[PDB]
Design a protein around this ligand. Structure first.
Ligand SMILES: O=C(O)[C@H]1[C@H]2CC[C@H](CC2)[C@@H]1Nc1nc(-c2c[nH]c3ncc(F)cc23)ncc1F
Length: 158
């Protein structure tokens, strides 16, 4: 039950989901039809330069604990996780001139945020983090922080 998305192998740990073909509205008010997965699932993301534990619900990321080679490798894994979550704020982060989508829309969403994750990370939201050791918060500019992180995202040492 393993699959590939954005260079990462995905394996389901726990949970289940059914698919619903659904219409979503971008920040540019454009209609995309995506195959939404309903239900709470846990995944391990395995890539060549990053690994992650992804806890998600229907169109909502619950938690992402990401480990990797450096900031860039980790950012790549966070981008895939946020696109994979199917969250409204990731879809609403598709905005502005030429930013349009033409055939799988999930792969288009990824290409878009791979080019520039600034609006995605900044529009995702930030939260206060209870102190933990060996786990750190990460800001939308990919700066480590003990005080705050992007909603549900934690960075763990390799
Ligand atoms: O739905 C699809 O067409 C594809 C493309 C876009 C992301 C996955 C990899 C390619 C997706 N394929 C698969 N997704 C899933 C899957 C389970 N939970 C999910 N939550 C969000 C999501 F997005 C995909 C999934 N399971 C098996 C798959 F095989």
């Amino acid at each position: 039950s393993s699959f590939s998305f954005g260079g990462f192998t995905f394996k389901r740990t726990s949970g289940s989901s059914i698919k619903r073909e659904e219409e979503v509205l971008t920040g540019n008010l454009q209609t995309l039809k995506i195959r939404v997965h309903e239900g709470y699932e846990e995944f391990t993301m395995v890539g060549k330069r990053a690994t992650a534990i992804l806890r998600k619900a229907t169109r909502r990321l619950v938690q992402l604990i990401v480990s990797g080679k450096d900031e860039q490798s980790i950012a790549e894994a966070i981008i895939v996780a946020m696109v994979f979550s199917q969250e409204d704020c990731m879809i609403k982060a598709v905005r502005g001139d030429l930013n349009f989508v033409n055939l799988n829309p999930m792969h288009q969403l990824l290409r878009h945020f791979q080019k520039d994750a600034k609006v995605l990370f900044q529009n995702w939201g930030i939260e206060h983090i209870d102190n933990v050791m060996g786990m750190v918060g990460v800001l939308p500019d990919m700066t480590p922080s003990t005080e705050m992180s992007m909603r549900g995202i934690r960075v763990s040492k390799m």
